[PDB]
Paper text:
Recently, a new bacterial species, [name], which can use PET as a carbon source, was isolated. The IsPETase structure belongs to the α/β hydrolase superfamily, and the central twisted β-sheet is formed by nine mixed β-strands (β1–β9) and surrounded by seven α-helices (α1–α7). At the active site of IsPETase, three residues Ser160, His237, and Asp206 form a catalytic triad and Ser160 is postulated to function as a covalent nucleophile to the carbonyl carbon atom in the scissile ester bond, as in other carboxylesterases. Based on the scissile ester bond of 2-HE(MHET)4, the substrate binding site can be divided into two subsites, subsite I and subsite II, where one and three MHET moieties are bound, respectively.
To elucidate the molecular mechanisms of IsPETase, its crystal structure was determined at 1.5 Å resolution. The structure reported here comprises residues Ser31-Gln292 visible in the electron density map. The asymmetric unit in the P212121 space group contains one molecule of IsPETase, indicating that IsPETase exists as a monomer. The substrate binding site is simulated to form a long, shallow L-shaped cleft on a flat surface with dimensions of approximately 25 and 29 Å. For binding of the first MHET moiety in the subsite I, the benzene ring is positioned on a ravine between the two aromatic residues of Tyr87 and Trp185. Compared with TfCut2, IsPETase has an extended loop in the region with three extra-residues (Asn244, Ser245, and Asn246). Interestingly, the unique conformation of the extended loop in IsPETase allows the formation of subsite IIb and IIc by constituting a continuous cleft from subsite IIa. The disulfide bond is also conserved in IsPETase and formed between Cys273 and Cys289. Interestingly, IsPETase has an additional disulfide bond between Cys203 and Cys239 in the vicinity of the active site.
Author numbering: 30 to 292
Amino acid sequence: GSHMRGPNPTAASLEASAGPFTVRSFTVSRPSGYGAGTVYYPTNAGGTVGAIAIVPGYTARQSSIKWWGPRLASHGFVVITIDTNSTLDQPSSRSSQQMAALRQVASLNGTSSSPIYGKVDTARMGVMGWSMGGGGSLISAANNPSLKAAAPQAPWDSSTNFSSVTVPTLIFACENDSIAPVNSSALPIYDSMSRNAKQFLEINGGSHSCANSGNSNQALIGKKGVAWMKRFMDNDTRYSTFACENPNSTRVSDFRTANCSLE
């Protein structure tokens, strides 16, 4: 059951600012169950693609996470970046809104007036987000185990117990994070997950914003995020190595992975 799109990847192709497909985007006119949204999609993926919903952190807006939209969509995904109903929404609410974004994407897929009519395989979805939006993505994965992948960054949640998560999860962590410190947040969350494919990628010297728009590690972090989503959302074993490998980067201070085969 693979859903391969695009050419055989290389490190270089995954490190570049964009994948092979042309991207277009639109603002959602009437958001349903969240505050606002921007949808990024490939015009020419050569078949239906999965959908990924991305949520910012507390006080933050789409600009924090917007670089993922084009970056992922150009590799063959429909990506929705959201603003929350309130910038002060907590993780459980962020999860609900993330799922609501995914639901609206599915709605749009079935709406013959929409730019993404027929472009989405609604059975294949993923979740991403920053800080509380990363905690929200973990909650989404716990509550919705049919999700195919999760890749939060600098996650924050008042609980670190995500032991029920069976969804393939990549945790981007930021070594010097003072907001959601790795030793009390990201790493205990990673360690908590005992039943899934998982990965822990800590960015050397990174502040809590180390995986946000404008970061200085977009080559590495974009390669890993796209590779993880391709491997797991698409069941694309062309990406096993890129998804599961230690990336051998002096930009990485800590790398861990489990249940993640290279080949």
